Design a protein around this ligand. Structure first.
Ligand SMILES: Nc1nc2c(ncn2[C@@H]2O[C@H](COP(=O)(O)OP(=O)(O)OP(=O)(O)O)[C@@H](O)[C@H]2O)c(=O)[nH]1
Ligand SMILES: [Mg+2]
Lengths: 431, 67
């Protein structure tokens, strides 16, 4: 009934998909063989005529080398083999190949899966997109796919959880370009866009979890703890139930401004949880903490236009309204003038679940914050700088234009950032 | 118009007591009946409940009646 369709694009898309879908099979006692020993899962699965529960997701990519792992690992009896869409050759970190050369022949195979996936849910809450902006598959196909989703469905809600190019840590050289081109295609097509960087989650692994050997298998385990804390109200009973429509309604002031940050709390090892109490007021203070942000941005340079809050565990509303009241008095935290309100709070009686061999601690209280701030105009300007730094020399251009593009695509996608920059100061009018 | 005693000229001397097929505080006004409409009309059987829609696309006719 309360059903959503999850998508995974590119490598990082499916490398987080292996984390979220390791979490849900665990959060509902779903054995790796599909089956288990209603509506507690019907958000994410579908019984067949024979026992099994199959997930309603889509792993899409142009590299067989990452999809076949799913086909060989312990989670191979789960997915309908048709949902795991792959490709002969890859996009090769080029926005063109993901947009003009290869992406055009597989979308029809993808869409025929989505259509076969839409009828099997009676009420569709909205699409979930796990993108990886900075490559060819993640950015090129995510661009092309998001458009086609707008034509076939229109106003349906498409969220976006897209890892963004980090300032310092950067595993590519051309990722400036295929990031810029992606913006217009996400901006005009995605409903809400959460952002997060591979670097910002590194330091959180450094200080809090204290794992000096962090890899991608660690970061993906964090995003799982976000969405489970976000969609708990879709499949777990709890006071102040909050759905996707209620979520974007009182969080997105204008159709343009739909970028926002994320923060989880607490993030503690299995031993400091014994040197601790983790009160609801303490957690929510560490949630608004800038160091606990999942993006390398500074909230104390801008103003909060809206905040959402998904609490989880032994929490009562009397405590939420009390701690939130303190922050409203805190001067370090600003708020743009035209929101005397600014919090949509949610509660869920179901605490988060811990994965065996995981790094977090079994806790009966947790907080996942998502705030639409105007300080995010910073991380959006570094890209404006590096892009123009290289594009003034036509470097790496012969690749893009050599694959069914021209030069105009750069200037359009360039200005689309320029216009979007001033909007992040327009809304900070203060008059 | 004699032998008729018209209403416009009947001093409060003359007056009538209302009888049953008529509402009055003394006897109970038992229940009445109304017609309740078919439901929300559709292309499948009409239903009373409103449901979600997967393909929104303003001004288009797409449903999933079978669930
Ligand atoms: N959080 C997280 N980020 C990842 C992961 N794997 C890759 N990334 C990042 O994704 C970005 C590159 O995009 P990729 O998905 O690897 O490549 P692509 O987008 O599929 O494009 P192609 O290489 O042509 O297939 C880099 O910034 C990676 O750091 C992961 O497992 N977890
Ligand atoms: Mg790739």
């Amino acid at each position: 009934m309360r059903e959503v369709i999850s998508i995974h694009i590119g490598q990082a898309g499916i490398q987080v998909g292996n984390a979220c879908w390791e979490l849900y099979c665990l959060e509902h006692g779903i054995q790796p063989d599909g089956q288990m020993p209603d509506d507690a899962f019907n958000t994410f699965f579908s019984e067949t005529g024979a026992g099994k529960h199959v997930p309603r997701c889509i792993f899409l990519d142009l590299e067989p080398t990452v999809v076949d792992e799913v086909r060989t690992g312990t989670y191979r009896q789960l997915f309908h083999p048709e949902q795991l869409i792959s490709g002969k050759e890859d996009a090769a970190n080029n926005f063109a190949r993901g947009h003009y050369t290869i992406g055009k022949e597989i979308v029809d195979l993808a869409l025929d899966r989505i259509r076969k996936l839409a009828d099997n849910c009676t009420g569709l809450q909205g699409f979930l997109v796990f993108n990886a902006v900075g490559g060819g598959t993640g950015s090129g196909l995510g661009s092309l796919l998001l458009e086609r989703l707008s034509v076939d469905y229109g106003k349906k809600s498409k969220l976006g959880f897209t890892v963004y190019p980090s300032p310092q840590v950067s595993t590519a050289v051309v990722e400036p370009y295929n990031s810029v081109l992606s913006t217009h295609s996400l901006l005009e097509h995605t409903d809400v866009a959460v952002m997060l960087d591979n670097e910002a989650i590194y330091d959180i692994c450094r200080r809090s979890l204290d794992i000096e050997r962090p890899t991608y298998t660690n970061l993906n385990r964090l995003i799982a703890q976000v969405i489970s804390s976000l969609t708990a109200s879709l499949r777990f009973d709890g006071a102040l139930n909050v759905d996707i429509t209620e979520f974007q309604t009182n969080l997105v002031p204008y159709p343009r401004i739909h970028f926002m940050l994320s923060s989880y709390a607490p993030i503690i090892s299995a031993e400091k949880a014994y040197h601790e109490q983790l009160s609801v007021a303490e957690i929510t203070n560490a949630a608004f903490e800038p160091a606990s942000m999942m993006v390398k941005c500074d909230p104390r340079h801008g103003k909060y236009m809206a905040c959402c809050l998904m609490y989880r565990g032994d929490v009562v509303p009397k405590d939420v309204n009390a701690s939130v009241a303190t922050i409203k008095t805190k001067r370090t935290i600003q708020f743009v003038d035209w929101c005397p309100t600014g919090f949509k709070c949610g509660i869920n009686y179901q605490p988060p679940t811990v994965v065996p061999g995981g790094d977090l601690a079994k806790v009966q209280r947790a907080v996942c914050m998502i705030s639409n701030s105007t300080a995010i105009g910073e991380i959006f300007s570094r890209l404006d700088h590096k892009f123009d730094l290289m594009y003034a020399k036509r470097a790496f251009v012969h690749w893009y234009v050599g694959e069914g593009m021209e030069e105009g695509e750069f200037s359009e996608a360039r200005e689309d950032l320029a216009a979007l920059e001033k909007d992040f100061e327009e809304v900070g009018a203060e008059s | 118009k004699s032998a008729f005693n018209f209403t416009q000229t009947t001093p409060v001397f003359m007056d009538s007591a209302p009888r049953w097929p008529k509402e009055n505080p003394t006897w109970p006004k038992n229940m009445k009946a109304t017609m309740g409409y078919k439901g929300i009309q559709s292309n499948y059987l009409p239903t009373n409940t409103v449901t979600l829609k997967a393909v929104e696309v303003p001004g288009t006719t797409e449903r999933n009646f079978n669930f």
